[PDB]
Amino acid sequence: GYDRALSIFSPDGHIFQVEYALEAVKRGTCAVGVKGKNCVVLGCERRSTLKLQDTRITPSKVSKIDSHVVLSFSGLNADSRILIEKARVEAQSHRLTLEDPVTVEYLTRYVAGVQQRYTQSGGVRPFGVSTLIAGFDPRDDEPKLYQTEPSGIYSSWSAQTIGRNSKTVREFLEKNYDRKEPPATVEECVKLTVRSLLEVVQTGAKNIEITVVKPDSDIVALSSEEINQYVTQIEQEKQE
Amino acid sequence: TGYDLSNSVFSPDGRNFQVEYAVKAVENGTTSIGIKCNDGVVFAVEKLITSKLLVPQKNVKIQVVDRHIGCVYSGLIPDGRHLVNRGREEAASFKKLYKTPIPIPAFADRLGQYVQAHTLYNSVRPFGVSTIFGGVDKNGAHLYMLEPSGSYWGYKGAATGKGRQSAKAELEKLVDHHPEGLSAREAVKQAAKIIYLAHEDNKEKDFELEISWCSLSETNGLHKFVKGDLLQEAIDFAQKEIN
Amino acid sequence: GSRRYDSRTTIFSPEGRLYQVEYALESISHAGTAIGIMASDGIVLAAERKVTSTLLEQDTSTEKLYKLNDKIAVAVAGLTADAEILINTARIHAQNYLKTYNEDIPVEILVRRLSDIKQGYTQHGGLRPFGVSFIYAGYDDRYGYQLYTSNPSGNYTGWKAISVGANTSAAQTLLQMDYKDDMKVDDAIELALKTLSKTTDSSALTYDRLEFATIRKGANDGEVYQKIFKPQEIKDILVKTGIT
Amino acid sequence: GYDRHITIFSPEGRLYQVEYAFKATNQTNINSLAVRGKDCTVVISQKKVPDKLLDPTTVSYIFCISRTIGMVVNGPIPDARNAALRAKAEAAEFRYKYGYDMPCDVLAKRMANLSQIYTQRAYMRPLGVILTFVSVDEELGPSIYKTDPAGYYVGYKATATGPKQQEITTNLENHFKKSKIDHINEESWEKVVEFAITHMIDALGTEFSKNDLEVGVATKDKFFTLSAENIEERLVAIAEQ
Amino acid sequence: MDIILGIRVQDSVILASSKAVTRGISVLKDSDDKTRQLSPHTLMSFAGEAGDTVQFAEYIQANIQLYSIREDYELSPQAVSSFVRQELAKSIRSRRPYQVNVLIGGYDKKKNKPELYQIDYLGTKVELPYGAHGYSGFYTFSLLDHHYRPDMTTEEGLDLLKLCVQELEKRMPMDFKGVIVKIVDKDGIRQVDDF
Amino acid sequence: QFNPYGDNGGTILGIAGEDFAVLAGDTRNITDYSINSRYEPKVFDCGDNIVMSANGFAADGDALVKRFKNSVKWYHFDHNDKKLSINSAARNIQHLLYGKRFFPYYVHTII
Amino acid sequence: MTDRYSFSLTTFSPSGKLGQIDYALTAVKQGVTSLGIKATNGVVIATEKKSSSPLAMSETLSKVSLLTPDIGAVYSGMGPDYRVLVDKSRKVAHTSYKRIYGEYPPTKLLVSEVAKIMQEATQSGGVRPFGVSLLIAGHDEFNGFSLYQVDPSGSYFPWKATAIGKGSVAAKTFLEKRWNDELELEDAIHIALLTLKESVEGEFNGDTIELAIIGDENPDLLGYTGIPTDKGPRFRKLTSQEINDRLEAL
Amino acid sequence: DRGVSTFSPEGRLFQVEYSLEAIKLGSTAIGIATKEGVVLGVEKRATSPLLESDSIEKIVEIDRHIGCAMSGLTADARSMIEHARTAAVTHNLYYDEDINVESLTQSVCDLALRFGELMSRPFGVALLIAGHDADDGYQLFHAEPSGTFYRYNAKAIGSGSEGAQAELLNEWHSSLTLKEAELLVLKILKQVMEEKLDENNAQLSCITKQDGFKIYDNEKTAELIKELKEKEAAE
Amino acid sequence: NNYDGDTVTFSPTGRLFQVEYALEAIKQGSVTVGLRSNTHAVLVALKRNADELSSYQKKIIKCDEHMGLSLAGLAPDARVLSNYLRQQCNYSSLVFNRKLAVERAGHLLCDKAQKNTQSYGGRPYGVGLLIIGYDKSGAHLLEFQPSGNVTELYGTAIGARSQGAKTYLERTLDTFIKIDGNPDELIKAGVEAISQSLRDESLTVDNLSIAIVGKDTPFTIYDGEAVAKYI
């Protein structure tokens, strides 16, 4: 087996392979998550350097880990599949031994642990992936949104964004999200999510993806149809 | 270049510079000799006294292998000990299977193949010692000298360390001026003298003399240390000859 | 030690790219162009060979188009040898699924496992990645006809029409231009050839430099036939479409 | 230029570590020669004991591999002994597994294959030796097979190895161009040894005492090496010209 | 533990499974569900050695639930039964084999047809109109051979099962404390909440 | 067939006082109908004011006492010369005995 | 700590080249010329026996090798690399075919196995590619006669006729002129001897030329009779004499 | 590159020294040890106003009698805390007793230097391990990724540490009450933190022999910040 | 220079720089002294605090009832080597019912250190040890050096400014060697020796560590209030 220490410390006290993994995330298509008062919404930019795509069969950018938790990501698509697979196995393993689905915090802490392990294991590079993990703890109606990054640190967010031009939309959400007043309705939360992407996303075309997670394993993804209705509405609210 | 940074790399001459660098650590060490006699061998070594805080008699450098084999070495002492520990495993394993204690030529090749093996890979360092060893087997006496390359031959006499050149020249004298043979007790005195003569080059500090011998008549074919009286006799013989 | 001679095939550039993946992709860009086009009633695979010599055995040959099972085929672009390692893996993986579930493997599941293998070689093991891009043409009873590509990175995506290998920028523009969703198989066959005709790096596009395969609905209804074209059939379809 | 340090190809398709291993071959400054009789194979090597403190009997580059196989080495002694011990182990194991004595050419091929591996695998260095294997094989008759660090081997009518190798080779080449046969047309091994020593003296242009030579002889069912006296006897006969 | 039954009717599969759990001399429980839902339209009943039964059932359940998440798709009953057979056929040459017999009742949504699979601990699978494991068959197969018809309604199937359970309660030496009955149809799995 | 167990007989007795404890045992070691020794002590001072006896098969008994005495030594090394409480000793011996659950020490242990 | 080389010694350069495969192909270019020709009723593979010394017995060094009774191999490049590849090719023909199906593998299947071994030296940790290109000629019941070339990369292509090594460019041109799809084996042997004369500098006779055919079955070469369906090997090495016989009508 | 376990000509391990630089970049952590208990305090340092500050867990329980504050690459501490908890629970199972704070620390420090060509690099995090045991009473330990651990009456680690440590050197005496130490940790944190100390960007904890290791709720800490600001207005 | 990349590389002069660098970590270490009569063997170790709020790094480790060592340099390496020695002492006790010879402890420590200096990916130990012990041939003092060089001495010192104490002991040789039957006088001589290696700051109660082993003395450590008697 290949033993080489690829993630090591530099004289300034930095791990360059971890910091370079974040550069791969920076390049990744933009992803955003917003906590409603009784929902969470995951928004995802999808680059339009290519059309002639088939979108029935192309990997969707939000993945179900269990029936009550979803995971979006920014960075290397191939790397994300390995984290998603491990998380889905751990979710079924938790149900099998504890007789309860994972809490969002637990599932986050697991994925974060996997990411960290690859920052001080021989013969491996860190994951070129940051993740937004969203959902509801079993028999709980309080919404959960967590972020993980290649280093393995994780934390809870009222709302957060990752990937290319994320600094732009984090500045938007910081300006447009009151913690004292979270988006009360589903539509309200979905609107604020699309708005933040439209700072960055170019057109309202098949460029935006929205997935909405409600309590008790109530997860549904919007079709272009229903997102266009927000894109159309916010555009006509710019008339000041 | 770059040819000398990795062990087991051939230079464009056809040399292994890391083995040649190992030899420098040997040359840097204290003087050690072997004298092959009539029915045995004698080993002697120069022990530099850093301080009168060294307990005399108590930092022994000559090592026995099995019961009939003496080993002495110059250079990196730990490397020598590690080689003797291997020699002991090799001699125990030989005895276990074949019942007879390991012949000296057979034993020499066991160290030979092991030392040579540390010139085959960049993941190990060559041995920082030249090892003078031998004893009495069923075919009489054998003296051997082994170098970091894995090269070894049988010797009439042999020397290594700082005083190797004076010793080498003093050994050559004996081979000429005693062609029919040197006795065990003779070789003990001669050994003591040659260590004192070769102390010329480590003149800086004064030293402690250590002799061992393996003679068919004098030690019954077993390796014993020359202690107490016969030691002081050879020390006195040597003091007389540096006058 | 041995660290001195290690290239580190699985590290990031300061820009967060995988050196070896990027250089492998560069390698594939010099390989004979392969095209996949998906119709409403089937899929076409077309591939150009690296400039053939007239003494090269024409008929009994398949360096670009390989069969995975009865319902899935791939077009290769890159090192043939690297591709055959991955193909035999995929063929086994398909047979494992069939033995386990007594059902033919869904096209995506096969594509995902092959992509997950490639991915591994980019994240651990300190080995070079596989210098291979695949176009997967297959049918299953969930999504019907499917076109995929995978590249040395372990990334895979779905396509209505796609090219890999040389002059893909040129080829992707020509396909994007003349492709429509209602398009039938025989139209897709004609498009595939027209595209290679325009993007080939020699003057004549003759039958002897082409491998061709179709996955058709055409059979005894409900079942799927998989056709790797004999050289005479490629000569016929080249005369039919009036390129020779 | 790290393609110079390990056994990987240079841009001109060369293995420099293999080429430099060949240079180590001549490091001992010894020349070896091998010829075939009707009944025997003779190997002669120069013996140089520069140091007077050395026991001259322990200085040898000829090895008794098996009952029937002899091996002379051109190269440093540690690599020579490494190679000798391996061939001894291989020839013994062959006998145990297959029920007959390992042939000269099969052991040559086996040792050559081992050499080949060191040229392909990076962590193993090639051995700086050329191995000349001699026997009277029970199927093939008198046999010379020689191995180099490249992992090349071939059979020889006769052969020479060392710094002055080219001079000894052309000398033997000329004898066979003339004599017009595969071998030394001689009854006794004693007269094939005499031939070998003679043509070594002519090619090198130097004279030998009994302690300047090392001799090995292969006959039916034993390979043996001559003592100082057996050689001295043989040198004395060469005087009658 | 003891008796497990299955019958495939017109457009549903009915699994009846004994409620008794006996530890030597004492009946420890009289309300045991010898069943796991593998997917929304696939149910597995099990009987065999203590521990092994539930361990195996829950292990299969987890594997099928993992497949469902990964592919966002429900495996056909045929595919699940083929997977389960292979796990048992695997285990029979293990150091310690799974000592479990199963019935897999599923509604194939893609083919709109109910399917019953009988698999023993050796990995011996058959598709059946009606099936049982252990001694249950010896009493009930005669009744089912007579009364069964491929085009029966669900209530007809429950009536034929009521007859089967009565014959067992008459002639079985062991008191199995009645059965829990579950129906698998196009709308999924529900429990007939008394018998 | 080789029987790895034997019976060396003997009897042991532990009584707890208010501020003292006694551990007593006979000094006879037997096999079958033979006396091996009339004085072979099987009650040992283990340090930290703990006395121990492992009565039954003397080989397993000596092995266990030896292992526990070593357990005391390493408790001192690893926990800064801390005194091993009788309850802590008791729990340690459980782990020593249960360590060989499927090839037991054929002894009845009293401390 | 023996083998630390668990990483590839062949990696992609920024240009997308695999350095060590290109360099291996360079080593093959330097190699002595070898060639192969497909006739309608057989295949011929041939090469020059360049002697190191005149004292060397060049019959002992065999460049043309039997792999199975119906498959032969010849090479250009590094002889030792060829020798171990022939050993592994012979063994893989048994371990992964004959010991399963009770018959010898077909030509393209055995070629596929040799190719695989060479691809692994291109990717596996701590090894260089093989410094040879092989020409593998063979017959199997369901494919008839065939000829394949295997390169250090592990890539293989079927040929009507080709050459590799020193004078391959020259020889490939010569073969294009003379090859037709109606050659009888004897005609292809004659063409092979003409093509090989061009590239051979020194002596050109039966003792400096190694030539084998995949032709008719040879009952005389089988070693036993009594089984009517074992008709014996299609591979045959031409004797020193048999080559000189054809150098008359040259 | 060069060996991961190689010495500088000074005679120090490069990778250990470089990890010590990573710890200097970490958020501040302070421990004060008194006869009435040991106090642990940390700067949370939320990287944005949107991240929920109470999800930042830089003070962590090991057993009921041992607590832990961290500073540096905090993700590296996951497995250190896991090992510590396992060690503490395991010792209890084998000896039916609480495990000494020094013995716990020594166990954690044994991980630290098990790296090289076992993990690929040293840990990029320092720990303040604080606890009580019957033998040696209230204890604070500093556990570095060098494998070395020191016992401290008070200690600061992280970006603020150089100034904070000189400030602790002044104000620590052997007769500090718990309440004084709580205030003294708040004071030195507020003094070295970039952003302004409130009950959301800083967090307190103590370990008492009586009530064990407790992390203070935001309401409890908020009233100690009031008490601090009131106190410093006087004189 | 280029030959200090790892322990497997010799310099052209024939030196192991990684070992010499390891040797360097010892001289940065706080001073420790060893000396012995015919009846007792004493270790005096000057302990180093991190700052004014920190504890004083413990420098003396017990190995058996009859043996123990003082450390200078990397304390984690002292822990590994002391722990290895404890096992060897323990093995000799359990298997052979035999207190391990101090001379044999030296050989085992030497052979362990050596293995780390000859093979790839390792590193020399960054610590020096002074081993005292009363065995079956009287009192013994050993100096361990992470090159693998172990030497039996009457007295010595290692660490920062250790040259001071080492010359005092070199002078006082004949005085201390005949302190037989007196424990306190042999310690006093050690506390006087260690004082030659001080500057600015000198011996307080909780910076000084003394260990003694001898004829009728189990290896025992004196700290805090129990060393006030010697300041």
* Domains of chain B, earliest start first: 1-243 (3.60.20.10)
CA distances from A108 to A63, A68, A104 (A): 14, 13, 6
Residues 96-125, chain E: which have Cβ within 8 Å of A? none
In G97-208, DSSP assigns E strands to 132-140, 144-150, 156-158, 161-164
Q: Residue F111 CA to chain centroid, in angstroms?
A: 7
- Which residues are bridge partners to H67 per DSSP? H61, H130
Q: Any idea which residue has 């920052």 for tokens? A: A119
CA distance G143 to G135: 17
H3–C contact, CB cutoff 8 A: yes
CA distance E15 to E48: 16
Q: Taking the C-alpha atoms of A181, A182, A187 and A193 in order, what is their torsion angle to the nearest 10 degrees?
A: 120
- Exposed, middle or buried, D171 (CB in 10 Å: 0-12/13-18/19+)? middle
Chain C residues closer than 8 Å to I120 by CB: 1-2
What structural domains does chain D harbor?
A: 1-241 (3.60.20.10)
CATH number of residue I64's parent domain: 3.60.20.10
Distance from CA of H184 to the nearest CA of A (A): 29
Architecture of domain A1-240: 4-Layer Sandwich (3.60)
Q: Could H103 and F80 be called an inter-chain contact, meaning their C-beta atoms sit closer than 8 Å?
A: yes
CA distance A113 to A121: 12
In chain I, count H helices and then E strands.
5, 10
H80 and H125 in contact (C-beta within 8 Å)?
Answer: yes
Chain C residues closer than 8 Å to H4 by CB: none
Rg (CA), chain I: 18
Q: Could A128 and C12 be called an inter-chain contact, meaning their C-beta atoms sit closer than 8 Å?
A: yes
B120–G contact, CB cutoff 8 A: no
Q: Residue H37 CA to chain centroid, in angstroms?
A: 15
F82–H contact, CB cutoff 8 A: yes
Q: Chain A to chain G, count of Cβ pairs less than 8 Å apart?
A: 7
Which token pair is B153?
């031959």
**Helix-strand-coil percent breakdown of chain D, rounded to 5?**
40, 25, 35
The DSSP bridge pattern shows strands C34-38 and C42-48 to be antiparallel
Q: Do chains G and C touch (3 or more CB pairs under 8 A)?
A: yes
Of residues G6, G8, G115, nearest to C128 (C-beta): G8
CA distance E115 to E184: 9
A220 and A70 in contact (C-beta within 8 Å)?
Answer: no
Chain H residues closer than 8 Å to F87 by CB: 96-97
3-state secondary structure at position I75: helix
CA distance A115 to A124: 11
Chain H residues closer than 8 Å to C3 by CB: 1, 3, 117
Q: Which residue is closest to I117 within chain H, CA to CA?
A: H6
Q: Could C100 and E83 be called an inter-chain contact, meaning their C-beta atoms sit closer than 8 Å?
A: yes
The DSSP code for F20 is -
Distance from CA of I94 to the nearest CA of F (A): 8
Which of D24, D44, D48, D25 lies closest to D34, judged by CA? D44
Distance from CA of I168 to the nearest CA of B (A): 11
Residue I23 domain boundaries: 1-231
E171–A contact, CB cutoff 8 A: no
Architecture of domain E1-195: 4-Layer Sandwich (3.60)
Which of B168, B138, B148 lies closest to B156, judged by CA? B168
DSSP string for B136-185: EETTEEEEEEE-TTS-EEEBSEEEESTTHHHHHHHHHHHHHH-SS---HH
Which of A41, A60, A75 lies closest to A148, judged by CA? A75
How many alpha carbons lie under 13 Å from residue A108 in its C-beta half-sphere? 24
Which token pair is E63?
């594997």
CA distances from B176 to B156, B173, I150 (A): 11, 5, 40
In chain F, DSSP assigns E strands to 12-16, 21-25, 29-31, 34-37, 43-45, 51-56, 107-110
Q: Degrees (nearest 5) of the Cα angle H157, H162, H164?
A: 75
Give φ, ψ of C19 to 5 degrees: -35, -60
Give φ, ψ of G247 to 5 degrees: -75, -10
CA distance H10 to H14: 10
Chain C residues closer than 8 Å to G155 by CB: 79-81
Total domains present in chain I: 1
Report the residue count for chain D.
Answer: 241
Tell me the catalytic residues of B.
30
F77 and I62 in contact (C-beta within 8 Å)?
Answer: yes
Q: Chain D to chain G, count of Cβ pairs less than 8 Å apart?
A: 104
Residues 87-146, chain H: which have Cβ within 8 Å of I? 109-110, 112-113, 116-117, 142, 146
Q: Which residue is closest to C2 within chain I, CA to CA?
A: I120
> How many other CB atoms are there within 10 angstroms of residue D185's CB atom?
11
I218–H contact, CB cutoff 8 A: no
CA distance B120 to C238: 62
The DSSP code for G129 is P
3-state secondary structure at position H167: helix
Those chains having 3 or more beta-carbon pairs within 8 angstroms of chain E are A, C
- Which residues are bridge partners to I142 per DSSP? I131, I152
Q: Could B25 and I14 be called an inter-chain contact, meaning their C-beta atoms sit closer than 8 Å?
A: yes
C29–G contact, CB cutoff 8 A: yes
- Which residues are bridge partners to I46 per DSSP? I208
Q: According to the entry, how was the structure determined?
A: X-ray
G2–I contact, CB cutoff 8 A: no
Of residues A10, A113, A120, nearest to H119 (C-beta): A120
Q: Degrees (nearest 5) of the Cα angle I165, I167, I171?
A: 115
Q: Which residue is closest to I157 within chain B, CA to CA?
A: B53
CA distance E35 to E58: 10
CATH homologous superfamily for H1-235?
Answer: Aminohydrolase, N-terminal nucleophile (Ntn) domain (3.60.20.10)
CA distance C126 to G6: 7
> How many other CB atoms are there within 10 angstroms of residue G180's CB atom?
9
Q: Taking the C-alpha atoms of A151, A157, A163 and A166 in order, what is their torsion angle to the nearest 10 degrees?
A: -130
Chain B residues closer than 8 Å to C6 by CB: none
I94–F contact, CB cutoff 8 A: yes
G155–C contact, CB cutoff 8 A: yes
CA distance C175 to E128: 52
CA distance A26 to B43: 72
CA distance D100 to D93: 10
Chain C residues closer than 8 Å to G118 by CB: 81
Distance from CA of I121 to the nearest CA of G (A): 9
Q: Where are the alpha helices (DSSP H) in chain I?
A: 17-28, 75-96, 102-115, 163-176, 183-194
Architecture of domain G1-249: 4-Layer Sandwich (3.60)
Q: Would you list the domain boundaries of chain E?
A: 1-195
Which of E21, E7, E15, E22 lies closest to E37, judged by CA? E15
- Which residues are bridge partners to A156 per DSSP? A146
Give φ, ψ of C109 to 5 degrees: -55, -45
Q: Could D152 and G127 be called an inter-chain contact, meaning their C-beta atoms sit closer than 8 Å?
A: no
Chain A residues closer than 8 Å to H48 by CB: 170, 174
Distance from CA of B93 to the nearest CA of G (A): 23
I6 and I18 in contact (C-beta within 8 Å)?
Answer: yes
Which token pair is C178?
């003349």
Q: Could A2 and G7 be called an inter-chain contact, meaning their C-beta atoms sit closer than 8 Å?
A: yes
The DSSP code for F73 is H
CA distances from I137 to B179, I100, I102 (A): 45, 11, 9
Q: Would you list the domain boundaries of chain H?
A: 1-235
DSSP string for chain C: --GGG---TT-B-TTS-BHHHHHHHHHHTTSPPEEEEE-SSEEEEEEEPSS--TTB--SS--SSEEESSSSEEEEEEE-HHHHHHHHHHHHHHHHHHHHHHSSPPPHHHHHHHHHHHHHHHHHBSSPPPP-EEEEEEEEETTTEEEEEEE-TTS-EEEESEEEESTTHHHHHHHHHHH--TT--HHHHHHHHHHHHHHH-SSS---GGGEEEEEEES-SSSSS-EEEE--HHHHHHHHHHTT--
CA distances from G36 to B214, G42, G176 (A): 71, 11, 12
Q: Do chains B and A touch (3 or more CB pairs under 8 A)?
A: no
Q: Could F85 and H97 be called an inter-chain contact, meaning their C-beta atoms sit closer than 8 Å?
A: yes
D91 and D106 in contact (C-beta within 8 Å)?
Answer: no
Chain G residues closer than 8 Å to A2 by CB: 6-7, 125
Q: Could H96 and F90 be called an inter-chain contact, meaning their C-beta atoms sit closer than 8 Å?
A: yes
Which token pair is D103?
């042939």
**What CATH fold (topology level) applies to the domain C1-244?**
Glutamine Phosphoribosylpyrophosphate, subunit 1, domain 1 (3.60.20)
A11 and H21 in contact (C-beta within 8 Å)?
Answer: yes
CA distance H128 to H67: 8
Which token pair is C87?
């193909």
D146 and D131 in contact (C-beta within 8 Å)?
Answer: yes
Q: Which residue is closest to H4 within chain C, CA to CA?
A: C3
Chain B residues closer than 8 Å to C4 by CB: 5-6
Query: At a CB cut-off of 8 Å and minimum separation 6, what does B52 contact?
Result: I170, I173
Q: Do chains B and E touch (3 or more CB pairs under 8 A)?
A: no
Q: Chain B to chain G, count of Cβ pairs less than 8 Å apart?
A: 7
Query: At a CB cut-off of 8 Å and minimum separation 6, what does E99 contact?
Result: E48, E49, E52, E121
